[PDB]
Amino acid sequence: TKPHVNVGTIGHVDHGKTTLTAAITTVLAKTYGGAARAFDQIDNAPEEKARGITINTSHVEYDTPTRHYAHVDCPGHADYVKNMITGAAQMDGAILVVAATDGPMPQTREHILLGRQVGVPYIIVFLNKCDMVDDEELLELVEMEVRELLSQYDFPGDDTPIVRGSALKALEGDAEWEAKILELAGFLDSYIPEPERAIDKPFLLPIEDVFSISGRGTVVTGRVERGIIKVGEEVEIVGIKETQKSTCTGVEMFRKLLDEGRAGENVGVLLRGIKREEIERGQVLAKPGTIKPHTKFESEVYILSKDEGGRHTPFFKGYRPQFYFRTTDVTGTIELPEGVEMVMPGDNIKMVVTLIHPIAMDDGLRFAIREGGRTVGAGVVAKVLS
Numbered sequence: 001t002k003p004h005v006n007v008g009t010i011g012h013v014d015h016g017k018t019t020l021t022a023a024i025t026t027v028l029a030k031t032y033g034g035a036a037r038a039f040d041q042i043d044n045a046p047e048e049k050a051r052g053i054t055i056n057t058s059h060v061e062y063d064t065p066t067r068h069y070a071h072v073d074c075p076g077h078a079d080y081v082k083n084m085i086t087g088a089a090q091m092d093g094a095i096l097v098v099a100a101t102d103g104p105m106p107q108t109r110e111h112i113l114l115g116r117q118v119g120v121p122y123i124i125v126f127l128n129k130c131d132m133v134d135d136e137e138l139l140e141l142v143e144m145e146v147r148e149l150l151s152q153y154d155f156p157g158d159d160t161p162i163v164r165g166s167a168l169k170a171l172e173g174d175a176e177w178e179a180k181i182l183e184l185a186g187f188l189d190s191y192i193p194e195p196e197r198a199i200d201k202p203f204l205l206p207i208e209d210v211f212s213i214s215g216r217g218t219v220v221t222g223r224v225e226r227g228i229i230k231v232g233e234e235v236e237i238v239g240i241k242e243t244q245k246s247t248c249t250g251v252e253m254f255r256k257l258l259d260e261g262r263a264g265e266n267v268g269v270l271l272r273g274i275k276r277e278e279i280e281r282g283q284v285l286a287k288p289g290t291i292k293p294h295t296k297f298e299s300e301v302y303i304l305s306k307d308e309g310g311r312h313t314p315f316f317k318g319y320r321p322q323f324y325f326r327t328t329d330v331t332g333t334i335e336l337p338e339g340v341e342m343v344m345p346g347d348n349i350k351m352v353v354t355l356i357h358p359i360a361m362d363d364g365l366r367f368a369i370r371e372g373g374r375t376v377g378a379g380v381v382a383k384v385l386s
């Protein structure tokens with residue numbers, strides 16, 4: 001029906017993320033239609049399991065006249081860390097809530113830093129609790145601090161929309177403050193571009209199985225994550241070993257012979273001139289010249305706590321685990337940040353990884369850290385190096 005956009009509230013503790021989320025749903029429901037959500041319903045977030053990783057997240061939905069929004073709000077800072085690193089709640093844009101009574105605080109910086117690291121494309125600021133501060137000069141000083149903090153982490157602070165509002169007064173029904181919620185939702189519509197749909201990105205298929213079919217020939221199976229593969233087009237096989245070119249001579253779903261495979265479909269792709277022995281676990285099919293294989297990358301990782309089923313023992317610089325990319329494990333070595341010699345369960349750090357086999361990757365690729373086939377961490381590629 002309507003374009004779908006994924007957003008969420010970030011910001012320091014008690015600056016009003018949950019109150020803002022309730023205010024958005026309530027004001028939009030009475031203005032444009034929809035269902036309002038109360039503060040208690042959003043604050044009492046359910047527990048979800050992405051892949052051994054426990055995250056507490058509330059998911060609300062609301063509509064502007066032209067868009068439908070999926071909005072995440074979390075009760076704990078650790079929940080935001082896990083969500084942004086695992087991508088369990090992906091964000092086309094984030095609402096940074098900064099309380100005017102405090103200005104930017106340590107978690108304001110940390111959430112902006114995580115945003116840049118995991119690739120949050122756009123940030124909108126809601127300067128909250130303005131019902132408490134009447135000083136115009138003080139509000140201007142805080143906005144300048146927020147803009148410089150955003151620019152410090154490469155966001156466009158000078159062009160960042162900043163709305164001076166009161167989430168509480170808007171939730172309580174003050175029309176003068178509800179108008180600021182509508183101004184915020186207006187920036188959601190106008191500042192966050194419509195996200196690029198997967199079918200319009202370069203073709204990519206992670207290979208999950210391989211078969212020799214009748215009359216020689218090789219078929220690889222998997223879900224088309226991005227783009228379209230058409231019969232006759234050339235493909236590259238990227239990862240694990242030297243990149244090979246091949247031609248797609250067929251696509252099929254079950255018993256149906258298709259002339260193309262589209263994003264989201266589970267297909268089998270027939271490859272010409274490729275034998276079964278030339279396909280390795282962890283490889284992908286890709287449009288030629290759109291993704292490259294790499295061994296070394298900078299990442300942000302979360303280490304599972306003991307209570308989450310992770311490891312009980314801390315690890316040190318010689319830690320040599322497996323990195324699960326899409327379909328398979330690849331062993332790698334790590335470099336810890338300067339001044340960090342021990343990493344506890346439950347910690348999150350920047351980590352430079354060197355794999356023993358290249359993996360087709362770019363910034364934003366998610367991965368799991370595993371020991372003996374059991375997930376002990378999750379990461380995101382922040383910057384490829386090799």
Ligand SMILES: Nc1nc2c(ncn2[C@@H]2O[C@H](COP(=O)(O)OP(=O)(O)NP(=O)(O)O)[C@@H](O)[C@H]2O)c(=O)[nH]1
Nearest residue numbers: 012013014015016017018019075128129166167168
């Ligand atoms: N005066 C005033 N108080 C507000 C406003 N918005 C939120 N508050 C108050 O500030 C407190 C924190 O609200 P909350 O939404 O829970 O903040 P939070 O950032 O979600 N907290 P947490 O980080 O724990 O999830 C509450 O007492 C709330 O009523 C506002 O615009 N004005």
Ligand SMILES: [Mg+2]
Nearest residue numbers: 017018074075
């Ligand atoms: Mg909250």
